[PDB]
């Protein structure tokens, strides 16, 4: 969850760092992010501090 973004960093050459395990998470904003770390990634561009609503893709 954003709790991981509480202390993360992203540069032009480093970019974002996420695991290779694909884990579908649900977004509390009514959205879904394939990989969990990819959630903070889409949050880095939106900058809305989205958190995981539930494990797995939203249903």
């Amino acid at each position: 969850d954003s709790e991981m973004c509480k202390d993360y960093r992203v540069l032009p050459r480093i970019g974002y760092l996420c695991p290779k395990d694909l884990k579908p998470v649900c977004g509390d904003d009514g959205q879904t992010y394939n990989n969990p770390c990819m959630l903070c990634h889409e949050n880095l561009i939106r900058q809305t501090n989205t958190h995981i609503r539930s494990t797995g893709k939203c249903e």
Side-chain angles (χ1 to χ4, degrees):
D1 298 341
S2 278
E3 258 184 26
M4 304 180 75
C5 319
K6 281 200 190 255
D7 180 7
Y8 81 110
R9 190 171 76 179
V10 176
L11 249 66
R13 294 182 184 218
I14 299 170
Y16 213 101
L17 182 75
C18 300
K20 294 188 182 185
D21 189 82
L22 179 54
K23 279 268 132 280
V25 298
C26 187
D28 58 8
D29 294 348
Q31 283 174 0
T32 312
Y33 306 80
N34 319 315
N35 167 297
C37 167
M38 267 184 88
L39 168 70
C40 198
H41 200 58
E42 194 168 340
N43 295 338
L44 183 69
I45 320 183
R46 295 184 188 297
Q47 299 179 346
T48 67
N49 197 10
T50 306
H51 308 77
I52 302 185
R53 179 181 187 185
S54 202
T55 75
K57 300 192 184 76
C58 306
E59 188 184 0

